């Protein structure tokens, strides 16, 4: 009998994991689906629960120790630009729910997975994205504990519903991944994000946070990217598995185009606003980095890796870039108009910001810079002015309509990007469509989208009353969560909103 | 390539821009969350309210219908998935305050300690004093069958994850599923290590597969697990059946009584480690699940009995299923060679009485299920020869 | 909300299981589906739907036995009969518009607690599979204006 | 109250002052240290050469006599403390590369997992199936005697720590002493937990003290431990006697064979956890100690046999002492009630043969000690009745 | 049989730890001693191996994660003043061996400890100081890996013997704790340091490192202080135990005075040099902080806690402060003279440093500032000058003699502090004594101190040859580990030292 010290390795356990399954008739995917992946499917990463736990625990402590010692010793929580403080506030608030619906959709995948190895990969995905949720929540917690504006992080979950961008983020990550069919959910929840959005989004957030001067986010986001690489590998493997299916060649390209368009339509303007208009120190124009990350280093490699299996690149990218060239600015105008609804505090671009925008974006001045200038000179920041940008927009004939499919705020008269307003009548209810693809999607599947526009939600409701009943007031009970100015002086009060007297008119009802 | 904090002029601009006074008095994260304990726990501080629920979902902060439902009229996260109803879905709090970080820490602990102790055991060569018959027949053939039961429960939790109407509940369910799958991995790894030490041992899963499929001993367990997978869509029903009743009857009896006591009294010392790991995992899962059901559903001030009547029916059906599975399984006791104490009928009846009594006092008294252990244990023992 | 208060208040009069089933049924038909009779009670219809769900559940299990609770619909139809009838109806639905209409009206008629949960989800899965194989096909080919005319929607402003 | 890195002008001054180019090409920490393995290990990178040794100490980088000796002519850290001689004292490297951080991590692992599993075992109430006689008599009376043996070895290492002529050797000795003391703590804590579960159990140490002092069963072990404490000042002799020969004979036989196998075959399941912990600790300590002696002293190119002859004499004397201790200890086998397999004479002789054979092939073959297991096991077994 | 979840606590284990001991005649302390502490002795901290391991492991990972993520992401290793880089180099090099001999002396204590509870406390002390050694070594490792001057940290242990201050640090911490008798070692190794030196030393190092801009050291030093608090408690408890001994009242005060004087005589000038002359940004004059920490918050509390047991305060403090008022400057002159022997690179004080010294230390200018000025103008930094400060000192009649007891460099003519030169003849060998207490100590116990003065060690040996054979050359093989200038240009070469031709003349031999 041998007595040499022998240490077992996870390789054999993973090898037997494939044979762990046993076959019988009644076993089936619980959820509706039209695709069935191959019963056998290899995974790039040989991962067991124990090895995964060790790998995650090492980096998790590492990052918690870093944040709990170095960041609090340097006092870097307070040494951040408040604009970027609000920007990271909204970023963390949105990404936490994004990753939560990510674990939900990955659980759907694991339910609709036949291969045991693929099931283990999906379980690792679920646990990794649970980690991501908790890390985002912990970033919010540390910002609340140390950063000088706690209010936005304290009531992040409760006051999230009031904002208009929240519906769009819900549609892209929350309901964008769980509502589809299981295969489709995979690409939207995984490939569409991991490749075209999450991979780049992270590096950009780290770089911009380093530029502005907050070291709390980078560490967490890099730790997230570590698992996101495994997510990419799992995506590629599961797309390989879903190939060779006769139905795959009939619907996979359509699902890919659907997911890509649905994700980009709101993703592009959202980041564009949160980066260009949410920071004082900008490293590089957002149009160039968006184009690069979404197309040059995504389409080439992924079509190289997938077209061998019969995958066609979406042709919506030619319209997507034309939209993206001004969609972030359009959403910027919409958000600056609807600031009282949102939780984050915002600052109008300054003269250096205006000249930066004009130098990087030709024609930005004559379209947006004056609009911001007359907004500033009409007592935008001043609480005693009692000026509401939405009231000015209504008085000027420019009225905002959100899409029914993507729920993105959209101004038809004040947008230079492509896309047009479409109003539809169906069984006594009017519907607003902003894009041809969205119009087609709503037309084919009216039962798919029933999201209630906030305009009829707040119809007959005064804005200050909506804020008060939505817990949009500060802890003191006299001031709003959001402010027109990044400065910590002359904070707006709910009585100022009452004096303004903005009333929602149902713009779509017209 | 310049950091905002390190750069001199950038840091000066940041320090000039930052306000001198804090804007909000309270730094507490999510103060509005009602804490189950005296103080808002950090686990509650993060995990709770992470789920965006519209107002038409119980305890929903958000408003408005789902922005993108399933194809057809069914909502993405509607309350039709569950059959039980509660005043609020966020009332559940894990008794261990176990969010992702402590759970993964403890799981890496289990990995590291298992590897170290396993290498030490290999160095000492204590395996040679084990009973030849025990490790040759019982573990290799039937201990690999419980592997498939644990894997079946694990893949079973695939739905609860997606159809969970809360966030702490989803985290607890995912952790329980991870416990099931890594218990399966522990069984497989123990078999591999035993094969590594003694030559001629069969590490292949073909024999456990044959035992799990074509052997009448585990037919009841296989049927119960298969009915658990796709028989019921309701995630509350899946959690209850696969955690309280069927688990704490069949899997608890198996692991705690047979594969632990008979392992000990047969000179085995490697198996008790893995049995203890599985027992700890089950203890944590059982605590979480009983806290869920008893605190939220079994004692809901409004839904009250409605939620219970349903638990009573599920408990009756799955208790009958688990009793049949145990009666079919008990034949392994006649399969193994006779030993005084555990193996003989009196010890078996006493073990069954202990298992059913603890299960009753843990679940049935709180839920209201009326069970007398005598007829149960007699029905299970009737299959013993 | 006043409307929610009034509706909750009138829910309190539902003391009969069959009457409660009829009330939930026609309320779903009136105010739940995208095909709707009147949008006046929009926005607030989901909360009233949840309240009537809870009240019907409360009336359920009051006299209903376990066997009917597990395998019999509230209206009195067998779960397997519902299975077979709706799968047969979906098989004969060649038109995608007819398919979506019948799927939505089935959801109106038999959804919990009217139907047992497990059989209801199995019906939903089968219907979703059929509707995905039947509707996802050729989405790009048909002209936008073709969809506009086929849906029957009338456009008001375009630019 | 201003930090140098955060302050703008201070950081600007620092950045102006720092040179643009690195002054030294190599960033390697202590490159001149000869690595035992292929690459300089991080444990070697820190721990090695931490001891300032003058040139008149083997492998000493420093120069000059001790700046402050003991009172009298004896140096503080002279080589007269040890009887063995080596070309260099820094050649020893722990096979596990175990410096303070991984060791304390693993020790906190043992603490956390032991607490969790212990709470889970308390919740499950598996203690009630244990043999009444076993846990009532054997553990309470005699298992607390091994507590005193472990504590005796632990306090025994008090000198090696101070009189160590190297740094890695000192770290290994301190870690081994910590392993001994926390094994004692594990025994005491297991007794406390058993007292906590079942009422009427005696958690006091008075009965273990009486067993360790006035009972003839442990008289040989007590004499050996007491001779280990103050009998020999030489730290090399202390390490050898208390780790290789006496330990791996007496304590290894006890823990591995009796208190583990007889615990298993008596329905005990709590004890195997603590026995496994002690076995892992002993495995690590034995690996470190055998690496030390065999690599440095037993195979020194210069001192050679000189160092060995001494190891042979120490092995002979302490092997006789340990054989006497085992012969006096074996009476517990007649004390416990008879069971086939382990308890009867044939099984006892086979266990002794296994223990002495593994000890021989692990130490004596490398050192050169000539031992035939037959007469040893016969002498030990002569005391068995 | 109860089945409630019960978790055991370390309190019961520690309670039984006292009864773990068993009594018999032959058990005795292995080492020589005149004191025997009480067989029973309570400890302030209820510590077991498992609880200690958990407490240490939590903070250990925390700090390693912080250093491995945040410090390397911010690049704070390179963003330090090189003067402070050399200062932390020598601090880490000296404290690692200090804590190593600390574990040795604490092992002696644990060998000479009768109480089991006291033995466990001593074992915890041993493990904590082992942690301290490894943390100091890890600080050196990280400085070597990231800081721009790796050489001093790379060969820290090998080139340590060449320096003259190394003998003094050996006498105070290395041989100051293990050579004495076991009780005496305790107070020197523990009370004398923990109270009068280690407690303050740390806070000062953190504060000064924060001022200069290195965040690597503070975290480690605070983690060390965490255990140092337990060390204080253990010291107080063991002094309580050693009380009530008839021999204690006869020798304890003498041992206390011995330990205090021996520690301060070299401790004060060493830090004074390493703080005032080793940093660009000074927070507070070293004389004031030294006086405060050594007397005001040490003597009051400790005499309050010990005089109840019959402990007399040392009266050497009145001479100690008079020495300390200029001892750091005296050692500064000695170290600037003997820079080629040391490993650390040094920079002469600048005009702002000179005016700071004069403002804080009256009369500093006319004594030291010119001496530094003529050193600077005589090609101190210039390698082509070939100027050796020791040669200038010999030519000017000021010759340095190190003490036989403390081995501190001492200039008689150029020192303003108290103390005088004493030369003694004993069996054909001359001996140099610098203090009356040191002279008495050497006279009573000639066999105690036999340390070889480096002057006779290097007699007949050229300085460049000594540096080359001592591995004092850089990795390239042409330049020295130490430099006359903190700047990274015009580094001195060994050929320049050869051109200088300094030869050790045996100053004591006269
Ligand atoms: Fe993610
Ligand atoms: Fe991901
Ligand atoms: Fe220390
Ligand atoms: Fe200390």
UniProtKB/TrEMBL annotation, chains A, E:
InterPro entries: Ferritin-like_SF (IPR009078), Phenol_Hydrox (IPR003430), RNR-like (IPR012348). GO terms for molecular function: metal ion binding; monooxygenase activity. Fe(3+) 3 binds at residues 129, 194, 228, 231. Fe(3+) 2 binds at residues 99, 129, 194. The keyword Oxidoreductase applies. Fe(3+) 1 binds at residues 99, 129, 132, 194, 228. Pfam families: Phenol_Hydrox (PF02332). Keywords: Metal-binding, Monooxygenase, Oxidoreductase. The keyword Cytoplasm does not apply. This is Methane monooxygenase. The lineage of its organism: Bacteria, Pseudomonadati, Pseudomonadota, Alphaproteobacteria, Hyphomicrobiales.
UniProtKB/TrEMBL annotation, chains B, D:
It comes from the Bacteria. CDD domains: AAMH_B (cd01058). InterPro entries: Ferritin-like_SF (IPR009078), MethMoxA_beta (IPR054956), MP_mOase_hydro (IPR012078), Phenol_Hydrox (IPR003430), RNR-like (IPR012348). Keywords: Monooxygenase, Oxidoreductase. Signal peptide: none annotated. GO terms for molecular function: oxidoreductase activity, acting on paired donors, with incorporation or reduction of molecular oxygen, NAD(P)H as one donor, and incorporation of one atom of oxygen. NCBIfam families: MethMoxAlphaMmoY. This is Methane monooxygenase.
TrEMBL record, chain C:
Pfam families: MeMO_Hyd_G (PF02964). One of its GO terms (biological process) is methane metabolic process. GO terms for molecular function: methane monooxygenase [NAD(P)H] activity. Keywords: Monooxygenase, Oxidoreductase. InterPro entries: Me_mOase_g, Me_mOase_g_dom1, Me_mOase_g_dom2, Me_mOase_sf_g, MethMoxGammaMmoZ. Transmembrane segments: none annotated. SUPFAM superfamilies: Methane monooxygenase hydrolase, gamma subunit. This is Methane monooxygenase. It comes from Methylosinus sporium. The lineage of its organism: Bacteria, Pseudomonadati, Pseudomonadota, Alphaproteobacteria, Hyphomicrobiales.
């Amino acid at each position: 009998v041998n007595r040499a010290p022998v240490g077992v390795e996870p390789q054999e356990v993973h090898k037997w994991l494939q044979s762990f399954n046993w076959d019988f008739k009644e076993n089936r995917t619980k959820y509706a689906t039209k695709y069935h992946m191959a019963n056998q499917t290899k995974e790039q990463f040989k991962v067991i629960a124990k090895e995964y736990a060790r790998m995650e625990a090492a980096k998790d402590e590492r990052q918690f120790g870093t944040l709990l010692d170095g960041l609090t010793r340097l006092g870097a929580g307070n040494k951040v630009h408040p604009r970027w403080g609000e920007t990271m506030k909204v970023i963390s608030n949105f990404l936490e729910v994004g990753e939560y619906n990510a674990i939900a959709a990955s659980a759907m995948l694991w339910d609709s997975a036949t291969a045991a190895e693929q099931k283990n990969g999906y379980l690792a995905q679920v646990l990794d994205e649970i980690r991501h949720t908790h890390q985002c929540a912990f970033i919010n917690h540390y910002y609340s504990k140390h950063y000088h504006d706690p209010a936005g992080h304290n009531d992040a979950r409760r006051t999230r519903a009031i904002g208009p961008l929240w519906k769009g983020m819900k549609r892209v990550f929350a309901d964008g991944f769980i509502s589809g069919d299981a295969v489709e959910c995979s690409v939207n929840l995984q490939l569409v994000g991991e490749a075209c959005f999450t991979n780049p989004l992270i590096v950009a957030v780290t770089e911009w946070a380093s530029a502005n001067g907050d070291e709390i986010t980078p560490t967490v986001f890099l730790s997230v990217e570590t698992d996101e690489l495994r997510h990419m590998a799992n995506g590629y493997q599961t797309v390989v598995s879903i190939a060779n299916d006769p139905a795959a060649a009939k619907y996979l390209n359509t699902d890919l185009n659907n997911a890509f368009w649905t994700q980009q339509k709101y993703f592009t303007p959202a980041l564009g606003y949160l980066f260009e208009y949410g920071s004082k120190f900008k490293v590089e124009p957002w149009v160039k980095t968006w184009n690069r990350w979404v197309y040059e280093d995504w389409g080439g490699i992924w079509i190289g890796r997938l077209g061998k299996y019969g995958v066609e690149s979406p042709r919506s990218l030619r319209d997507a870039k034309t939209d993206a060239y001004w969609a972030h600015h359009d959403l910027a105008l919409a958000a600056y108009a609807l600031w009282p609804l949102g939780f984050a505090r915002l600052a109008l671009p300054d003269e250096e910001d205006q000249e930066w925008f004009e130098a990087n974006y030709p024609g930005w001045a004559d379209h947006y810079g004056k609009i911001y200038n007359e907004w500033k000179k009409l007592g935008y920041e001043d609480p005693k002015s009692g000026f509401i940008p939405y009231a000015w927009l209504l008085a000027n004939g420019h009225d905002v309509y959100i899409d029914r499919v993507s729920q993105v705020p959209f101004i038809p008269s004040l947008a230079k990007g492509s896309g047009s307003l479409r109003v539809h009548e169906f069984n006594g209810k009017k519907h607003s469509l902003t894009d041809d693809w969205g119009e087609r999607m709503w037309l084919s599947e009216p039962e798919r989208y029933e999201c209630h526009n906030l305009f009829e939600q707040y119809e007959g409701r005064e804005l200050s009353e909506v804020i008060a009943e939505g817990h949009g007031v500060r802890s003191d009970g006299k001031t709003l969560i959001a402010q027109p100015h990044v400065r910590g002086d002359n904070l707006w009060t709910l009585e100022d909103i009452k004096r303004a007297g903005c009333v929602f008119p149902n713009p779509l009802a017209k | 390539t310049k950091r905002g904090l390190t750069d001199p002029e950038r840091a000066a601009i940041i320090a000039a821009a930052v306000p001198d006074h804090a804007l909000d008095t309270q730094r507490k994260y999510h103060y509005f969350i009602q804490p189950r304990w005296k103080r808002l726990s950090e686990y509650e501080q993060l995990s709770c309210y992470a789920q965006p629920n519209p107002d038409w979902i119980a305890g929903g902060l958000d408003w408005g219908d789902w922005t993108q439902k399933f194809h057809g009229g069914r909502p993405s996260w509607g309350n039709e998935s569950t059959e039980l109803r509660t005043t609020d879905w966020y009332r559940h709090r894990d008794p261990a305050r176990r969010w992702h970080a402590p759970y993964v820490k403890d799981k890496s602990e289990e990995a590291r300690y298992t590897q170290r102790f396993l290498a030490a055991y290999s160095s000492e060569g204590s395996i040679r004093t084990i009973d030849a018959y025990w490790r040759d027949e019982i573990l290799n053939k039937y201990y690999g069958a419980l592997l498939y039961n644990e894997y079946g429960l694990f893949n079973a939790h695939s739905s609860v994850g997606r159809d969970c109407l809360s966030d702490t509940i989803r985290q607890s369910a995912t952790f329980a599923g991870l416990d099931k799958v890594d218990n399966a991995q522990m069984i497989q790894m123990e078999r591999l290590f035993i094969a590594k030490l003694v030559p001629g041992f069969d590490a292949s899963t073909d024999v456990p597969k044959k035992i799990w499929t074509t052997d009448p001993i585990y037919a009841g367990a296989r049927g119960a697990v298969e009915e658990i997978w796709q028989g019921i869509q309701d995630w509350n029903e899946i959690l209850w059946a696969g955690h309280a009743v069927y688990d704490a009857t069949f899997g608890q009896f198996a692991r705690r009584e047979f594969f632990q006591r008979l392992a000990t009294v047969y000179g085995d010392t490697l198996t008790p480690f893995f049995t203890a790991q599985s027992q700890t995992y089950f203890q944590t899962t059982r605590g979480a699940i009983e806290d869920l059901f008893v605190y939220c559903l079994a004692n809901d001030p409004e839904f009250g009995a409605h939620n219970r009547t349903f638990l009573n029916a599920w408990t009756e059906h799955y208790l009958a299923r688990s009793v049949t599975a145990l009666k079919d399984f008990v034949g392994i006791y006649a399969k193994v060679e006779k030993v005084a104490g555990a193996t003989d009928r009196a010890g078996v009846s006493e073990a069954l009485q202990r298992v059913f009594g603890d299960w009753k006092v843990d679940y049935a008294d709180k839920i209201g299920f009326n069970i007398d252990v005598d007829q149960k244990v007699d029905a299970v023992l009737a299959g013993f020869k | 909300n006043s409307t929610r208060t009034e509706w909750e208040g009138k829910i309190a009069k539902l003391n009969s299981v069959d009457q409660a089933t009829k009330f939930i049924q026609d309320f779903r038909v009136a105010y739940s589906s995208p095909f709707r009779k009147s949008y006046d009670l929009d926005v607030d219809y989901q909360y009233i739907e949840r309240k009537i769900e809870e009240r019907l559940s409360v009336l359920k299990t009051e006299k209903l036995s376990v066997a009917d609770l597990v395998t019999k619909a509230t209206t009195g139809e067998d779960a397997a009969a519902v299975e077979a009838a709706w799968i047969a109806k979906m098989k004969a639905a060649e038109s995608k518009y007819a398919a979506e209409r019948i799927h939505i009206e089935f959801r109106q008629l038999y959804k919990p607690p009217v139907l047992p949960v497990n059989v209801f989800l199995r019906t939903d899965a089968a219907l979703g599979t059929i509707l995905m194989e039947l509707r996802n096909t050729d989405y790009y080919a048909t002209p936008l204006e073709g969809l506009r005319k086929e849906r029957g929607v009338k456009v008001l402003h375009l630019q």
